[PDB]
Design a protein around this motif. Structure first.
Motif, PDB file in Angstrom:
ATOM      1  N   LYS A 172      -2.392   1.377 -11.727  1.00 32.69           N
ATOM      2  CA  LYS A 172      -1.504   2.534 -11.519  1.00 32.69           C
ATOM      3  C   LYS A 172      -1.819   3.111 -10.157  1.00 32.69           C
ATOM      4  O   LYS A 172      -2.961   3.397  -9.843  1.00 32.69           O
ATOM      5  N   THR A 173      -0.787   3.280  -9.358  1.00 35.73           N
ATOM      6  CA  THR A 173      -0.949   3.716  -7.965  1.00 35.73           C
ATOM      7  C   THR A 173      -0.433   5.159  -7.741  1.00 35.73           C
ATOM      8  O   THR A 173       0.203   5.757  -8.622  1.00 35.73           O
ATOM      9  N   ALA A 199      -6.003  14.352   0.375  1.00 37.89           N
ATOM     10  CA  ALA A 199      -4.730  14.336   1.137  1.00 37.89           C
ATOM     11  C   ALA A 199      -3.534  14.191   0.194  1.00 37.89           C
ATOM     12  O   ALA A 199      -2.442  14.735   0.456  1.00 37.89           O
ATOM     13  N   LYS A 227     -15.242   2.810   0.882  1.00 34.68           N
ATOM     14  CA  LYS A 227     -14.090   1.917   0.760  1.00 34.68           C
ATOM     15  C   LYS A 227     -13.398   1.944   2.114  1.00 34.68           C
ATOM     16  O   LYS A 227     -13.011   3.022   2.607  1.00 34.68           O
ATOM     17  N   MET A 252       3.801  -1.635  -6.301  1.00 36.41           N
ATOM     18  CA  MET A 252       3.638  -0.188  -6.164  1.00 36.41           C
ATOM     19  C   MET A 252       4.956   0.623  -6.264  1.00 36.41           C
ATOM     20  O   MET A 252       4.936   1.770  -6.648  1.00 36.41           O
ATOM     21  N   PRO A 298      -8.266   6.435  -6.213  1.00 36.52           N
ATOM     22  CA  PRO A 298      -7.923   7.129  -4.980  1.00 36.52           C
ATOM     23  C   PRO A 298      -6.905   8.229  -5.234  1.00 36.52           C
ATOM     24  O   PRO A 298      -6.292   8.256  -6.317  1.00 36.52           O
ATOM     25  N   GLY A 343     -10.746   9.992   1.252  1.00 38.18           N
ATOM     26  CA  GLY A 343     -10.687   9.523   2.646  1.00 38.18           C
ATOM     27  C   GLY A 343     -10.417  10.674   3.590  1.00 38.18           C
ATOM     28  O   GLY A 343     -11.351  11.363   4.019  1.00 38.18           O
ATOM     29  N   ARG A 344      -9.141  10.925   3.852  1.00 37.20           N
ATOM     30  CA  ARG A 344      -8.721  11.896   4.877  1.00 37.20           C
ATOM     31  C   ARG A 344      -9.267  13.304   4.669  1.00 37.20           C
ATOM     32  O   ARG A 344      -9.582  13.990   5.645  1.00 37.20           O
ATOM     33  N   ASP A 400       0.848  -1.213   0.000  1.00 32.93           N
ATOM     34  CA  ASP A 400       0.000   0.000   0.000  1.00 32.93           C
ATOM     35  C   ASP A 400       0.873   1.249   0.000  1.00 32.93           C
ATOM     36  O   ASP A 400       2.100   1.153  -0.048  1.00 32.93           O
ATOM     37  N   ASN A 433     -10.142   0.603   4.210  1.00 33.20           N
ATOM     38  CA  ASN A 433      -8.842  -0.003   4.002  1.00 33.20           C
ATOM     39  C   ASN A 433      -8.524  -0.907   5.191  1.00 33.20           C
ATOM     40  O   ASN A 433      -8.417  -0.436   6.316  1.00 33.20           O
ATOM     41  N   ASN A 455     -12.421   8.110  -4.871  1.00 36.22           N
ATOM     42  CA  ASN A 455     -12.307   7.862  -3.461  1.00 36.22           C
ATOM     43  C   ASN A 455     -11.708   9.075  -2.751  1.00 36.22           C
ATOM     44  O   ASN A 455     -10.649   9.569  -3.151  1.00 36.22           O
ATOM     45  N   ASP A 465     -10.880   5.204   6.722  1.00 40.08           N
ATOM     46  CA  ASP A 465      -9.574   4.691   7.150  1.00 40.08           C
ATOM     47  C   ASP A 465      -9.228   5.303   8.492  1.00 40.08           C
ATOM     48  O   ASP A 465      -8.363   6.168   8.563  1.00 40.08           O
TER      49      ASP A 465
HETATM   50  O1  LIG Z   1      -2.670   3.761  -5.428  1.00 38.68           O
HETATM   51  C1  LIG Z   1      -3.380   3.685  -4.373  1.00 38.68           C
HETATM   52  C2  LIG Z   1      -4.051   2.516  -3.991  1.00 38.68           C
HETATM   53  C3  LIG Z   1      -4.795   2.581  -2.796  1.00 38.68           C
HETATM   54  N1  LIG Z   1      -4.844   3.728  -2.053  1.00 38.68           N
HETATM   55  C4  LIG Z   1      -5.665   3.740  -0.842  1.00 38.68           C
HETATM   56  O2  LIG Z   1      -6.732   4.723  -1.034  1.00 38.68           O
HETATM   57  C5  LIG Z   1      -6.885   5.434   0.195  1.00 38.68           C
HETATM   58  C6  LIG Z   1      -6.471   6.913  -0.030  1.00 38.68           C
HETATM   59  O3  LIG Z   1      -7.017   7.586   1.098  1.00 38.68           O
HETATM   60  P1  LIG Z   1      -6.829   9.179   1.308  1.00 38.68           P
HETATM   61  O4  LIG Z   1      -5.501   9.546   0.786  1.00 38.68           O
HETATM   62  O5  LIG Z   1      -7.959   9.802   0.519  1.00 38.68           O
HETATM   63  O6  LIG Z   1      -6.984   9.379   2.818  1.00 38.68           O
HETATM   64  C7  LIG Z   1      -6.059   4.720   1.267  1.00 38.68           C
HETATM   65  O7  LIG Z   1      -6.910   3.674   1.826  1.00 38.68           O
HETATM   66  C8  LIG Z   1      -4.938   4.113   0.436  1.00 38.68           C
HETATM   67  O8  LIG Z   1      -4.372   2.975   1.080  1.00 38.68           O
HETATM   68  C9  LIG Z   1      -4.187   4.850  -2.454  1.00 38.68           C
HETATM   69  O9  LIG Z   1      -4.217   5.935  -1.801  1.00 38.68           O
HETATM   70  N2  LIG Z   1      -3.468   4.792  -3.588  1.00 38.68           N
END
Ligand SMILES: O=c1ccn([C@@H]2O[C@H](COP(=O)(O)O)[C@@H](O)[C@H]2O)c(=O)[nH]1
Ligand SMILES: O=c1ccn([C@@H]2O[C@H](COP(=O)(O)O)[C@@H](O)[C@H]2O)c(=O)[nH]1
Lengths: 318, 318
Positions: free
Chosen positions: B191-192, B266, B100, A166, B262, B291-292, A139, B102, B289, B22
């Protein structure tokens, strides 16, 4: 620090056998059946042979007892899940360099199985046997910090597995705490045992180099930047026991690397061929994981002894 | 079946906002502090606004109560963790196409957090809001079956995320039950959002095609072989909100694909740029998505409303 711990353990048990403890529902139910019929022979051994005897923190009173009644289906299941795990450990620990617990097996029952996992890691911690959580964690850094807390603070695992699709920056948040003062080891997936593992690991490439090589190279670049090895830790590689060409290549490119090699037994990996190809004189550096071929055998102790013997004979050849 | 469920929900809330839940230790502790001072205002809303009201299965009596005493540190923490989650849901559900969660955030406290996660998924199931477990699961088929049981039988999640570095055959054991009679959806990492995500996803290639493209192509080849779409399900893609070139390429190559994106908030992803590049007229097919930027905001409801508004305005442009 893990490098010394593995070296010390290796000299104590004279093997690189890593016992996989992946209990499934049939394993647990079967152990429950046979214990009910033999009058709880294996639990009795668990209770006397846990040396200074072990006191489980999760459901300790009930585990250290008579068993729960069949009417209490959840408690009964927890009791027999824990005692199945302790049975495998007690039957095989004389032959084990390490135990690897795959997280997935401890999840289908909800929080019940996580309490079991805690008791397993706590018992191994009591026995001081090297431990690996097979979690394949991956992650972003912020999230990885929470995996780190569970794996290393809560379970007090010695190591875990990680998937670096990643990128390698994630290693900074699993291998080091926030303050940069505690260091932890992990094994990164490089080559896996499944039939179609070549589709990305081998078919993708950069500059003539197959993906699994690029992944290994980048991993060790990061391990060096994190100074793990000066702090007694390492980033190792998962390389399947059936991946003979790759394990040879990895040992050649990184003579001092730590390899975790699942696939012998249920998955039909050729132990001798893999150990020869992956060989290090420092033989804790090829952990040969064997799960089902031990845990589903008629006699886990005999099965473990047999692998212990084979590995001894192959190491002698080498 | 998920495709209809997402379409129905999309028409109900008119958005593709996916709320990330999260919670970290500071979130929980802070919510506990403010609730103690305001006299438990948010828990009171949780108890009345859960409609037919929700009955948590894990610690239901204590959650539906006065709060636990400070002397009971574990129970108190569980109470405020659950009620923090319910608070976010209740403050934002009018604006959410999906939630979602985590998995990593629900682990550092041992089994306690898994009970919380169960209550969260059960509440979302009660509300019938689409759910995603961000677990990034990856293993061999036998092990994957156990992840499937936890994710789909225990949590009754609508979907999860998966990492296919191992190969695409793993999709057979997460997307289908044993009998081949139930079908489940997942989103595969393509893609991350992390800074070094290009090191493998873009730098590795096959036959002129970057890794992330080869991964996407192979994924959809497998999705078609599994007949998910005729059974109301899909294999989607995770494509970071900051991955503008890639999200455009993915939407071009797979016009009908479901994307989970995502990174907005943040992580500073450009919502408008990503939504434009990733756009589908069927806009449940880009789950944005956040989250924070919601869960750590002074006002989750206002933050969610704001994103809801932005997305509406951008969809209107398109
Ligand atoms: O490439 C990725 C894959 C998954 N997440 C997940 O998406 C959420 C992003 O949350 P936030 O940055 O909106 O708080 C977290 O659960 C993080 O682990 C990412 O941010 N980026
Ligand atoms: O490429 C890999 C990576 C991990 N594992 C894990 O190693 C163990 C193999 O167990 P067994 O086949 O010896 O029972 C399981 O936990 C499995 O998830 C593999 O088998 N192959």
């Amino acid at each position: 620090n893990l490098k010394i711990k593995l070296q010390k353990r290796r000299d104590e048990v004279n093997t690189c056998l890593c016992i996989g403890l992946d209990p499934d529902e049939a394993d647990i139910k079967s152990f429950m059946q046979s214990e009910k019929q033999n009058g709880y022979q294996s639990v009795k051994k668990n209770l006397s042979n846990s040396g200074e005897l072990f006191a489980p923190q999760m459901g300790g009173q009930m585990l250290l007892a008579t068993p729960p009644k069949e009417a209490q289906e959840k408690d009964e299941f927890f009791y027999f899940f824990n005692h199945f795990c302790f049975y495998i450990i007690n039957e095989t620990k004389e032959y084990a360099l390490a135990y690897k617990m795959n997280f997935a097996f401890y999840l289908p029952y909800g929080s019940l199985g996580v309490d079991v996992l805690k008791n397993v890691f706590d018992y191994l911690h009591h026995l001081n046997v090297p431990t690996i959580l097979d979690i394949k964690m991956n992650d972003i850094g912020n999230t990885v910090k929470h995996y780190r807390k569970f794996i290393f603070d809560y379970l007090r695992s010695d190591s875990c597995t990680a998937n670096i699709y990643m990128g390698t920056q994630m290693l900074r948040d699993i291998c080091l705490d926030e303050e940069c003062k505690r260091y932890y080891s992990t094994f990164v997936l490089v080559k896996t045992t499944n039939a179609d593992s070549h589709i990305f690991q081998n078919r993708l490439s950069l500059d003539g180099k197959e993906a699994y090589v690029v992944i290994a190279e980048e991993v060790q670049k990061m391990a060096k930047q994190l100074h793990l090895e000066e702090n007694g830790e390492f980033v190792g590689f998962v390389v399947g026991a059936n991946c003979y060409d790759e394990i040879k290549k990895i040992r050649e490119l990184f003579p001092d690397c730590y390899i975790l090699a699942p696939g012998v037994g249920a998955q039909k990996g050729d132990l001798r061929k893999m150990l020869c190809n992956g060989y290090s004189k420092n033989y804790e550096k090829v952990l040969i994981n064997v799960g089902r071929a031990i845990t589903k055998s008629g006699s886990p102790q005999q099965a473990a002894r047999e692998y212990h013997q084979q590995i001894k004979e192959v190491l002698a050849e080498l």
